[PDB]
RNA sequence: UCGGAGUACAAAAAACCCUCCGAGUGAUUUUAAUCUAGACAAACCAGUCAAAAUAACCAUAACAUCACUUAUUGAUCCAAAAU
RNA sequence: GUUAAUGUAGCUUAAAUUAUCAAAGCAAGGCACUGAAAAUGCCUAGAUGAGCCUCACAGCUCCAUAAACACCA
């Protein structure tokens, strides 16, 4: 009993005859490109993306952030070839281009880099990581302005906190300093949050530095609310994503309310919600910048939990599930001699009435 | 999971090519205008991506489709993989481009650019 | 054309045989067994003949 | 399935050809000459022959790529076998011969298929306008005796040729 | 006796002194280890796969390949050989 | 001069200071690679018709392409 396709055939636009005709492939680098592109399109029929978590496929992303700049493109389409053709006629480029011997000024990249598509790959980034889903849920903000957080670890060394990157707690045991270009025209907010590590609830994040109303690029000048912590990852889980926000704020606002004792070591007054702490204010501030790395433990966690917050270290371990076994027979047939190990209790024989 | 190398691998395929058992593969792609490259995770989701069509790369490059234009995609490539925290991935070429002198040299941009291939293999696979 | 069913010791000292279908045209054998008792690969040769 | 909506979409034997295998018994070069359709000429073989061989070859290649960009189906891109003639000229003051040079002939020949009737004024425009030097352009049909010079020469059936007449 | 196609049209099984092809081994070297979760198959005897783990060697290396690859085979007892 | 169709590279994407990271992809070429093609390696060339309008939607107009009334032996 045949029936009918619910849609179109894959196949089914060329034609079958005149086969000599149609262009061939002739590669096989074609055919996995063409494989790719046809491989993400949501075909009618049961597919892998389907199955295996493809996170509810289109979701309507909500943007809270800063408008991007306003870029001339007819002005920019112009500047932009401008400036190629000057590199293009060098002939000294020509010579180092063709010899494969040229290299380019990674630095300078990188500065531009920030600049130009910095806020759109810090974005996946942290959609990657899922810190979105942690803080505003389904909401999402590009961050516009740049970051830049820094450990004093030596006497000059600078250990520095890219997006995603990795920390030891010895380099985050002091505070870290921020800088960021902004004119003395508007406020700046803070925050440093641990977003897993809570001990008692796992939808609760901890809450490590807050600095309020930050007269410009001075982080040292603006108000303080929460003092730093250094971080205290458990030692058993590993690898604690801790995450710097930063929201621009229009006018100065009472963030009294969220204020925290200063020698502040009781974790159950640490317990923070994000979402919640942006829907008090979501008028005033609003995200600009992120900058997060992964923490694993260390033996400066010990210290903290012993001489600051006064508590017994808690040690945890990856446990796996127990094997599976069926269930077991009276008579096992054509089975090893080892069918009655898989079910027994202990290795330590057991005499009964004897 | 993924950073304590017990997470799952996908293993299984085998009849299809590439494997598709990894936790970040690198995907370069060489149009006969740009070169991009790029690290993607299991679920499809690119992570980290550095392409000649960036303005940043495209100003500081001769042409864009030479041997060199590889190096830069992968110097720079190799940079931000470590910024993103990114040590391990899997990079599986074609039998050809293998042999290839751009992509010979590319990978030598990566393993002095601190980005290191063959993924640790999985604890309790 | 027959082949020969040959006996192979290990000439690491230790006492393993293995036997491999041979050709009988063919020469002595010598091949690069893996014997369980050393765990190292060693050296294998030719030593009866058992089975046509 | 035959019950699932998705039923035949693996189907590929109908995107390829058949491509019938060289059988070891059947393995014969079986073309159906095409001759004389409404608007299509038949066979046509594109004899290109000159003294050098760099430069016949040169001008070959020319003619069976201008056919792939003109959708211009080529069945074959053979050679024909090379022809030496003793170059032997006549001594002055004298009889006898002299042993002159050695010249040699290089025949290449790029094999098309049918083409458009109005097709054939354009197509052989484009050829004859760019030979070369000294290139003999050739275009005849693709009889069996034109294809015959590319095999060997067979004396064993010459002997019972000769003796059945 | 053993395998493949049809009879047996779409999971499995399914007969005839039914219709057609084969097998009772060669060629080559990559000479192919030990130990164990879970399963297919099956009256029984037999047959098949196999993660993890250990050793071997790129120093985090296990499918011998090709010939329609599917069949290329024989239970106890007993006898001979180093065990 | 006048009457009716169209004008990102060869086709076509994004774009079209409507916002965004950006003028993209495939074709088309040179050289090397058993002799032809084809693959592969290395490598070359580049357009947002023109102005105006809108400056925060994009279209009108101009010019040009191109047909027509229509100069022609
Ligand atoms: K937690
Ligand atoms: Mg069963
Ligand atoms: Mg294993
Ligand atoms: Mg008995
Ligand atoms: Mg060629």
């Given at each position: 009993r045949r029936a009918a396709p619910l849609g179109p055939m894959p196949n089914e636009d060329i034609d079958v005859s005149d086969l000599e005709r149609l262009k061939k492939y002739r590669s096989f680098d074609r055919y996995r490109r063409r494989a790719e592109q046809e491989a993400r399109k949501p075909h009618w029929w049961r597919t892998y993306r389907e199955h295996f978590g493809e996170e509810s496929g289109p979701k309507d992303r909500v943007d809270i952030g800063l408008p991007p700049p306003k870029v001339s493109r007819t002005q920019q389409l112009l500047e932009r070839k401008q400036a190629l053709r000057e590199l293009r006629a060098n002939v000294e480029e020509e010579r180092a281009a063709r010899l494969q011997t040229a290299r380019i000024p990674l630095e300078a990249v990188r500065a531009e880099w920030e600049r130009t598509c910095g806020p759109y790959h810090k974005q996946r980034l942290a959609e990657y990581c899922g810190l979105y889903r942690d803080l505003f849920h389904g909401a999402t903000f590009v961050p516009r302005v740049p970051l830049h957080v820094a450990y004093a670890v030596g006497e000059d060394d600078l250990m520095p906190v890219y997006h995603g990157n990795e920390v030891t707690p010895t380099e985050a045991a002091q505070a870290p300093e921020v800088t960021y270009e902004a004119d003395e025209g508007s406020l700046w907010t803070l925050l440093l949050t641990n977003l897993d590590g809570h001990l008692l609830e796992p939808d609760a994040e901890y809450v490590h530095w807050l600095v309020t109303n930050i007269p410009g690029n001075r982080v040292t000048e603006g108000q303080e609310t929460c003092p730093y912590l250094p971080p205290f990852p458990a030692r058993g889980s590993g690898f604690h994503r801790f995450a710097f926000l930063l929201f621009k704020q229009d006018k100065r606002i009472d963030f009294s309310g969220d204020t925290r004792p200063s020698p502040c070591y009781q974790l159950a007054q640490r317990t923070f919600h994000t979402f919640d702490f942006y829907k008090k204010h979501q008028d005033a501030m609003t995200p600009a910048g992120l900058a997060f790395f992964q923490c694993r433990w260390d033996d400066s966690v010990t210290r903290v939990f012993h001489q600051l917050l006064d508590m017994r270290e808690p040690v945890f371990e990856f446990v796996r599930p127990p094997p599976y076994h069926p269930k077991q027979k009276r008579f096992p047939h054509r089975q090893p001699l080892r069918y009655l190990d898989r079910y027994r209790d202990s290795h330590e024989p057991t005499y009964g009435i004897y | 999971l993924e950073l304590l190398a017990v997470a799952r691998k996908e293993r299984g395929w085998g009849t299809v090519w590439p494997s598709r058992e990894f936790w970040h593969r690198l995907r370069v792609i060489r149009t006969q205008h740009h070169i991009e490259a790029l690290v993607e995770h299991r679920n499809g989701q690119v992570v980290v991506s550095a392409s000649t069509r960036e303005w940043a790369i495209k100003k500081h490059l001769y042409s864009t489709r030479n041997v060199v234009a590889c190096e830069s995609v992968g110097r720079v490539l190799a940079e931000r993989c470590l910024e993103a925290g990114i040590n391990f991935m899997v990079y599986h070429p074609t039998p050809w481009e293998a042999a290839s002198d751009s992509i010979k040299r590319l990978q030598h941009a990566m393993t002095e650019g601190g980005v290191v291939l063959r993924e640790p293999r999985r604890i309790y696979e | 054309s027959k082949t020969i069913l040959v006996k192979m010791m290990s000439?690491?000292?230790?006492?393993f045989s293995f036997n491999t279908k041979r050709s009988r045209l063919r020469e002595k054998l010598t091949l690069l067994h893996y014997d369980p008792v050393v765990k190292k690969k060693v050296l294998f040769v030719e030593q009866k003949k058992i089975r046509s | 399935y035959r019950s699932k909506p998705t039923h035949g979409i693996g189907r590929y034997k109908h995107l390829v050809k058949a491509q019938e295998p060289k059988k070891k018994k059947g393995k014969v070069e079986v073309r159906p000459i095409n001759l004389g359709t409404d608007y299509e000429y038949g066979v046509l073989n594109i004899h290109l022959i000159a003294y050098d061989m760099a430069l016949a070859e040169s001008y070959a290649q020319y003619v069976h790529n201008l056919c792939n960009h003109l959708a211009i189906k080529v069945e074959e891109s053979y050679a024909m076998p090379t022809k030496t003639m003793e170059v032997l000229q006549l001594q002055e003051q004298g009889s006898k011969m002299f042993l002159d040079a050695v010249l040699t002939t290089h025949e290449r020949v790029v094999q098309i298929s049918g083409l458009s009737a109005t097709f054939a004024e354009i197509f052989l425009e484009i050829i004859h306008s760019n030979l070369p030097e000294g290139v003999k352009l050739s275009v005849r049909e693709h009889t069996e005796e034109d294809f015959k010079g590319r095999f060997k020469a067979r004396p064993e059936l010459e002997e019972l040729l000769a003796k059945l007449n």
């Amino acid at each position: 009993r045949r029936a009918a396709p619910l849609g179109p055939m894959p196949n089914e636009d060329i034609d079958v005859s005149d086969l000599e005709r149609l262009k061939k492939y002739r590669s096989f680098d074609r055919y996995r490109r063409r494989a790719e592109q046809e491989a993400r399109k949501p075909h009618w029929w049961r597919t892998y993306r389907e199955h295996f978590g493809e996170e509810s496929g289109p979701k309507d992303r909500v943007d809270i952030g800063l408008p991007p700049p306003k870029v001339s493109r007819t002005q920019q389409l112009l500047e932009r070839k401008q400036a190629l053709r000057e590199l293009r006629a060098n002939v000294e480029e020509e010579r180092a281009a063709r010899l494969q011997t040229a290299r380019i000024p990674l630095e300078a990249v990188r500065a531009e880099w920030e600049r130009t598509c910095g806020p759109y790959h810090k974005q996946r980034l942290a959609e990657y990581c899922g810190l979105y889903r942690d803080l505003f849920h389904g909401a999402t903000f590009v961050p516009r302005v740049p970051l830049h957080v820094a450990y004093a670890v030596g006497e000059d060394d600078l250990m520095p906190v890219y997006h995603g990157n990795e920390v030891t707690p010895t380099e985050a045991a002091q505070a870290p300093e921020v800088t960021y270009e902004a004119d003395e025209g508007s406020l700046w907010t803070l925050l440093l949050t641990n977003l897993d590590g809570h001990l008692l609830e796992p939808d609760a994040e901890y809450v490590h530095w807050l600095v309020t109303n930050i007269p410009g690029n001075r982080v040292t000048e603006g108000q303080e609310t929460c003092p730093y912590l250094p971080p205290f990852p458990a030692r058993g889980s590993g690898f604690h994503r801790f995450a710097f926000l930063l929201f621009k704020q229009d006018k100065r606002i009472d963030f009294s309310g969220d204020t925290r004792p200063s020698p502040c070591y009781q974790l159950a007054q640490r317990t923070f919600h994000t979402f919640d702490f942006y829907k008090k204010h979501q008028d005033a501030m609003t995200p600009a910048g992120l900058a997060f790395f992964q923490c694993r433990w260390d033996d400066s966690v010990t210290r903290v939990f012993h001489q600051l917050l006064d508590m017994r270290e808690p040690v945890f371990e990856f446990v796996r599930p127990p094997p599976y076994h069926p269930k077991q027979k009276r008579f096992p047939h054509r089975q090893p001699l080892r069918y009655l190990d898989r079910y027994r209790d202990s290795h330590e024989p057991t005499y009964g009435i004897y | 999971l993924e950073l304590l190398a017990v997470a799952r691998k996908e293993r299984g395929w085998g009849t299809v090519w590439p494997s598709r058992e990894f936790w970040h593969r690198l995907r370069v792609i060489r149009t006969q205008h740009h070169i991009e490259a790029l690290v993607e995770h299991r679920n499809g989701q690119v992570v980290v991506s550095a392409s000649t069509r960036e303005w940043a790369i495209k100003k500081h490059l001769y042409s864009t489709r030479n041997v060199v234009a590889c190096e830069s995609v992968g110097r720079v490539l190799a940079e931000r993989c470590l910024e993103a925290g990114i040590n391990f991935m899997v990079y599986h070429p074609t039998p050809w481009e293998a042999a290839s002198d751009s992509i010979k040299r590319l990978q030598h941009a990566m393993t002095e650019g601190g980005v290191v291939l063959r993924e640790p293999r999985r604890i309790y696979e | 054309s027959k082949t020969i069913l040959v006996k192979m010791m290990s000439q690491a000292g230790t006492g393993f045989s293995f036997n491999t279908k041979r050709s009988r045209l063919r020469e002595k054998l010598t091949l690069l067994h893996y014997d369980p008792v050393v765990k190292k690969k060693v050296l294998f040769v030719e030593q009866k003949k058992i089975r046509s | 399935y035959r019950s699932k909506p998705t039923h035949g979409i693996g189907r590929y034997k109908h995107l390829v050809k058949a491509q019938e295998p060289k059988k070891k018994k059947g393995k014969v070069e079986v073309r159906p000459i095409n001759l004389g359709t409404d608007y299509e000429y038949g066979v046509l073989n594109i004899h290109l022959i000159a003294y050098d061989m760099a430069l016949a070859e040169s001008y070959a290649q020319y003619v069976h790529n201008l056919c792939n960009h003109l959708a211009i189906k080529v069945e074959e891109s053979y050679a024909m076998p090379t022809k030496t003639m003793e170059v032997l000229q006549l001594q002055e003051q004298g009889s006898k011969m002299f042993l002159d040079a050695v010249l040699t002939t290089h025949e290449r020949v790029v094999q098309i298929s049918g083409l458009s009737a109005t097709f054939a004024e354009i197509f052989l425009e484009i050829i004859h306008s760019n030979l070369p030097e000294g290139v003999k352009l050739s275009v005849r049909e693709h009889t069996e005796e034109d294809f015959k010079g590319r095999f060997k020469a067979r004396p064993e059936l010459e002997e019972l040729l000769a003796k059945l007449n």
